[PDB]
Ligand binder design. Structure first.
Ligand SMILES: [Mg+2]
Ligand SMILES: [Mg+2]
Ligand SMILES: [Mg+2]
Ligand SMILES: [Mg+2]
Ligand SMILES: [Mg+2]
Ligand SMILES: [Mg+2]
Ligand SMILES: [Mg+2]
Ligand SMILES: [Mg+2]
Ligand SMILES: [Mg+2]
Ligand SMILES: [Mg+2]
Ligand SMILES: [Mg+2]
Ligand SMILES: [Mg+2]
Ligand SMILES: [Mg+2]
Ligand SMILES: [Mg+2]
Ligand SMILES: [Mg+2]
Ligand SMILES: [Mg+2]
Ligand SMILES: [Mg+2]
Ligand SMILES: [Mg+2]
Ligand SMILES: [Mg+2]
Ligand SMILES: [Mg+2]
Ligand SMILES: [Mg+2]
Ligand SMILES: [Mg+2]
Ligand SMILES: [Mg+2]
Ligand SMILES: [Mg+2]
Ligand SMILES: [Mg+2]
Ligand SMILES: [Mg+2]
Ligand SMILES: [Mg+2]
Ligand SMILES: [Mg+2]
Ligand SMILES: [Mg+2]
Ligand SMILES: [Mg+2]
Ligand SMILES: [Mg+2]
Ligand SMILES: [Mg+2]
Ligand SMILES: [Mg+2]
Ligand SMILES: [Mg+2]
Ligand SMILES: [Mg+2]
Ligand SMILES: [Mg+2]
Ligand SMILES: [Mg+2]
Ligand SMILES: [Mg+2]
Ligand SMILES: [Mg+2]
Ligand SMILES: [Mg+2]
Ligand SMILES: [Mg+2]
Ligand SMILES: [Mg+2]
Ligand SMILES: [Mg+2]
Ligand SMILES: [Mg+2]
Ligand SMILES: [Mg+2]
Ligand SMILES: [Mg+2]
Ligand SMILES: [Mg+2]
Ligand SMILES: [Mg+2]
Ligand SMILES: [Mg+2]
Ligand SMILES: [Mg+2]
Ligand SMILES: [Mg+2]
Ligand SMILES: [Mg+2]
Ligand SMILES: [Mg+2]
Ligand SMILES: [Mg+2]
Ligand SMILES: [Mg+2]
Ligand SMILES: [Mg+2]
Ligand SMILES: [Mg+2]
Ligand SMILES: [Mg+2]
Ligand SMILES: [Mg+2]
Ligand SMILES: [Mg+2]
Ligand SMILES: [Mg+2]
Ligand SMILES: [Mg+2]
Lengths: 77, 46, 93, 61, 102
RNA sequence: CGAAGGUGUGCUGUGAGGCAUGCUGGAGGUAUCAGAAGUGCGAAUGCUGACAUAAGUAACGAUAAAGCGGGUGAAAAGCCCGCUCGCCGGAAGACCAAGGGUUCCUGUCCAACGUUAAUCGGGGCAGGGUGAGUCGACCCCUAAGGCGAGGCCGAAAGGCGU
RNA sequence: UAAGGUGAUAUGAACCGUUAUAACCGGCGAUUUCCGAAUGGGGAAACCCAGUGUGUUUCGACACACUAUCAUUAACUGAAUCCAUAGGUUAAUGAGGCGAACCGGGGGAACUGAAACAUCUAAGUACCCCGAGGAAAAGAAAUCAACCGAGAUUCCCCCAGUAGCGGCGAGCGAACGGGGAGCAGCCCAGAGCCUGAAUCAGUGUGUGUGUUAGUGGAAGCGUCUGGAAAGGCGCGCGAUACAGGGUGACAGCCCCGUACACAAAAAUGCACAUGCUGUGAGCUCGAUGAGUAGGGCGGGACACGUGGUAUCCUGUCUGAAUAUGGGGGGACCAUCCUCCAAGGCUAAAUACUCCUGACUGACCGAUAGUGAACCAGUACCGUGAGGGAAAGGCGAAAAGAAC
């Protein structure tokens, strides 16, 4: 549904603002991409729909750390 | 002159019948309102 | 086969009438008023047993309850089943 | 008459049920043909069948 | 517990025949009593062959308010009231003016 | 030994009003001094009910059409029986589907219903009546289309679809 | 508990009962068709059609049980593909649906006001959606204050229509501080001392104390009027009972109650006493929350409309220090003071009433009061969502008018 599987980032709402300060509603979507992540420690690829920010989490924590967090919450991959 | 109500029992049921109502969140709210009011007959379904 | 408890329920009454009288003294048919859910087979069984006659065939139909009034009230009598039961050849009861 | 039959065997009142049921039927017919002036009777068998089937129900359980 | 019962002998307190006595005949759930030869009425009665054959007029008893009758002592020869106590295990009724069981 | 309410008559105050009493009614009423308001109606093409007016006036729904004799009946232009006359006949005849649901048949009744009368009725009341291996449904098989395990997609609700 | 009973319109007929297996009242059981989440498959709701067992048969048939989906766990099994993995089957456990308000969260109008209207207002309101509990939510300071000090959260009264915000228009509108209600604090990021030691929790035990039927419950007569006396007149009595209701007109003493005093075979609520069953207290030393705080860009929340604008949240791109450290004190800097974010849990004061009992009203009394005092969400209207009435009173007693 356009939800980052790593972080949780989903669409949020807010306002366009003109020079005359007319406000119309809008959405701010995440920067999602489907991406095959190599897991060394079970010799396969896993595909997560993830946001640019969630990829920086995976670089830092390491995929094995992150896929433990995914299993906890019971979100499938 | 042909008038607006041309009866058909099959169409009455597929449209306004009990199971039709039960098949949608909106239709289930119709039966919930009609029970709440106290209606003696929820739907058309003889 | 059918258990007897059941059989004791499926017959409900004899049904009198001009037509029933005639049916009896012409085509050797007894006209009963039977349980709404009783199959033809259960009727045949129940008669054979509970009256000790022999039954050729049963016919059945469903009578619809008439709508009535009782002083500005709407009523409705119950639907009920009517069996025509032809016996074999020479029995009577 | 509950105690009068509370003690008698499973089979004993298993046979009691059927001849109650048989009487119910016989009443039903005579009633239906205006040969029953004792209406109260067919009410009583009904309540007897009731209290047999209950007694069956506890023993079996 | 009911203070006055079937087959009691009572004196009328109130109404067209104040003062006069009779036996209780049967007791209604409305809180009324039939009392033999008390509240007599003249019912006009239509004929009907099967039950109550002829026409004719009738006298019969009409129900009377039970509050309007009193258990009659027949020792004082006067109206009375009823209490409740146990004479050895069984609730009983006693006059109050003369505390004897009845 | 007659409350409120209703309807008369008499008296009385500058006014909104007050007091007395006949008849009706058949169980409530409230001096005084204070207190509180759903506190006063002729109008809003006001709202609800009732009753007038036009007026015993227009009308009684296809211009296919009736006439007489008998019957029953409190009563017959209209009902029943008969004779004659008329109208439809690719329908104004007959059988069905859909839709309706006892309107079907007998007996009984004429208050209301029937644009009149009604002994008559699709009206009231009671009783009867619908019988299937082969007719139809159900059943087997699919069309458009619908629902749709997993699935794909979407803030949620949901949307598509194997 | 009892001398009367078989619910109403509603009689009648057949019966049942009177000293206790008649009826009636309460506790625990039994039975409980079909449809409906509906769950064996289907379906135009209350119907159509099955599969597998186990049992039975008069060989025609019969009765009962089980069989939905998803989530988790376990076993068994298992492709492309060697190990695997995905998948498949069975079982166990749980969920599903309904419901009046209150509560937390995801979305989010316009009419209207500005005497036009776009910023602003209406308003984070109506409405839709998700989730929850008897309440929820919030909660033990990276909080305030002013160099004096205070000490978690919630709610009430003030401060104050003040300070501010504002096409500085219409309007919006705090805090600091003070007075009250209620009061409570703990735990993980970890090893030794060390135990069943704190007491949260589960399940039996007694004992109290409620609940669900019930029992006893004072004392008045005469006489007038009248259809009838409870009213008038006369003379008595009760009162821890003169609340209230009924009875042929207005009754402390006619009846039912009321004050007060009593009661439970059975089930269950709360509180102490408590075995046992999981449960860990105390002390020492250490540790102490990173794609995080901060930043740029776009928005939102703060009374505060980007303004000189601190503080909070983050869609997007970035990114520290780590106690010799870090956050805040309304641009910003220095000094000083105060606190320790990136991990949790927590009772009471507070919100509400679909429903149950009791009691109350300067609330209505049939065009009023609920739409509905009456068989009303009915009759009727509408394809449907939905709309939606009218209609109470014989008499004390039917004695409801024989002939
Ligand atoms: Mg706007
Ligand atoms: Mg045949
Ligand atoms: Mg048939
Ligand atoms: Mg008078
Ligand atoms: Mg008045
Ligand atoms: Mg007054
Ligand atoms: Mg005044
Ligand atoms: Mg007014
Ligand atoms: Mg007027
Ligand atoms: Mg005027
Ligand atoms: Mg006009
Ligand atoms: Mg004229
Ligand atoms: Mg003229
Ligand atoms: Mg004319
Ligand atoms: Mg004409
Ligand atoms: Mg004509
Ligand atoms: Mg003629
Ligand atoms: Mg004519
Ligand atoms: Mg049809
Ligand atoms: Mg009819
Ligand atoms: Mg006919
Ligand atoms: Mg006829
Ligand atoms: Mg006439
Ligand atoms: Mg007429
Ligand atoms: Mg007819
Ligand atoms: Mg298809
Ligand atoms: Mg699905
Ligand atoms: Mg979409
Ligand atoms: Mg689909
Ligand atoms: Mg007993
Ligand atoms: Mg099913
Ligand atoms: Mg289904
Ligand atoms: Mg099928
Ligand atoms: Mg698996
Ligand atoms: Mg739920
Ligand atoms: Mg909400
Ligand atoms: Mg606007
Ligand atoms: Mg304006
Ligand atoms: Mg204006
Ligand atoms: Mg909201
Ligand atoms: Mg709480
Ligand atoms: Mg919390
Ligand atoms: Mg200090
Ligand atoms: Mg008592
Ligand atoms: Mg007493
Ligand atoms: Mg007198
Ligand atoms: Mg007196
Ligand atoms: Mg009176
Ligand atoms: Mg911390
Ligand atoms: Mg930041
Ligand atoms: Mg900043
Ligand atoms: Mg910014
Ligand atoms: Mg400014
Ligand atoms: Mg700062
Ligand atoms: Mg900060
Ligand atoms: Mg400063
Ligand atoms: Mg944060
Ligand atoms: Mg309360
Ligand atoms: Mg209440
Ligand atoms: Mg009135
Ligand atoms: Mg009304
Ligand atoms: Mg309709």
């Amino acid at each position: 549904s356009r939800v980052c599987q790593v972080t949780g980032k989903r669409p949020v709402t807010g306002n366009n603002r003109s020079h005359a300060l007319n406000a119309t509603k809008r959405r701010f979507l995440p920067n999602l991409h489907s991406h095959r992540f190599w897991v060394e420690s079970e010799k396969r690829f896993v595909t997560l729909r993830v946001s640019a920010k969630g990829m920086r989490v995976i670089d830092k924590k390491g995929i094995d750390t992150v896929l433990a967090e995914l299993r906890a919450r019971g979100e499938k991959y | 002159m042909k008038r607006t109500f041309q009866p058909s029992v099959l169409k009455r049921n597929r449209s306004h019948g009990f199971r039709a109502r039960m098949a949608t969140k909106n239709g289930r709210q119709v039966l919930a309102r009609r029970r709440a009011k106290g209606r003696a007959r929820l739907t058309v379904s003889k | 086969m059918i258990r007897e408890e059941r059989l004791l329920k499926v017959l409900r009454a004899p049904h009198v009438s001009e037509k029933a009288s005639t049916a009896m003294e012409k085509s050797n048919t007894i006209v009963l008023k039977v349980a709404k859910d009783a199959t033809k087979a259960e009727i045949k069984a129940a008669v054979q047993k509970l009256f000790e006659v022999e039954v050729e065939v049963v016919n059945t139909l469903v009578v619809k309850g008439k709508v009535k009034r009782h002083g500005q009230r709407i009523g409705r009598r119950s639907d009920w089943k009517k069996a025509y039961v032809t016996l074999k050849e020479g029995q009577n009861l | 008459k509950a105690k009068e039959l509370r003690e008698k065997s499973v089979e004993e009142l298993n046979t009691e049920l059927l001849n109650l049921l048989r009487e119910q039927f016989n009443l039903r017919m005579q009633a239906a043909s205006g040969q029953l002036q004792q209406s109260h009777l067919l009410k009583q068998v009904r309540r007897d069948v009731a209290r047999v089937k209950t007694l069956l129900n506890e023993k079996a359980g | 517990a009911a203070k006055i019962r079937r087959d009691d002998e009572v004196i009328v307190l109130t109404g067209k025949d104040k003062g006069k006595r009779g036996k209780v005949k049967n007791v209604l759930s409305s809180g009324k009593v039939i009392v033999e030869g008390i509240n007599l009425v003249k019912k006009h009665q239509k004929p009907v062959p099967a039950l109550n054959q002829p026409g004719g007029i009738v006298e019969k008893e009409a129900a009377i308010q039970v509050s309007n009758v009193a258990i009659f002592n027949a020792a004082t020869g006067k109206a009375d009231r009823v209490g409740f106590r146990f004479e050895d295990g069984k609730k009983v009724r006693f006059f109050k003016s003369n505390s004897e069981t009845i």
